[PDB]
């Protein structure tokens, strides 16, 4: 997958060691089909591809988080769009985390506080703010 050095992972994922939980991930659910299409895609991913996503993810926080500051609802145009923006970013970055799939991530993310703590490192409750943004976004699209 990532096949990076502790130093690259640091320059790329910051103070986050995903590799250590590589095989540990499947322990949680390890039953998805998407993950199969992703592994094929992440098979050769390099630090660049991985860093490209981080700088991209950082951007996601300021705007999302900034929305929170303004006190605007998550199902707001700006928020939901942000959600649709997240979708295409994580989808084209692994295989194509569809809308229905993108949602599965939203909530299954609130369950494990390990993700939250690592994700919320930017701000508490962000996970909830995104899920609703993604959920709503999926609704306006859903037939």
């Amino acid at each position: 997958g990532i096949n990076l050095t502790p130093e690259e992972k640091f320059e790329v994922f910051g103070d986050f060691d995903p590799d250590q939980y590589e095989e540990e991930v499947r322990e949680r659910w390890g039953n998805t089909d998407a993950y199969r299409q992703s592994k094929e895609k992440t098979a050769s991913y390099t630090k660049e591809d991985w860093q490209r996503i981080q700088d991209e993810a950082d951007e996601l926080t300021r705007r999302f988080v900034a929305l929170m500051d303004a006190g605007e609802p998550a199902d707001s145009e700006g928020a939901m769009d942000a959600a649709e923006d997240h979708r295409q970013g994580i989808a084209r970055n692994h295989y194509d985390c569809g809308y229905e799939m993108h949602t599965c991530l939203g909530e299954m993310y609130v369950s494990d506080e390990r993700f939250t703590r690592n994700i919320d490192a930017a701000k508490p409750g962000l996970a909830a703010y995104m899920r609703d943004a993604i959920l709503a976004n999926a609704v306006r699209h859903t037939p």
Binding site: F16, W29, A34, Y35, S38, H94
Partner: peptide, 11 residues
């Protein structure tokens, strides 16, 4: 899907 710890997935 796609990782266990911040953002990709499978469900």
């Amino acid at each position: 899907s796609c990782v266990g710890x911040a953002c990709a997935x499978x469900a």
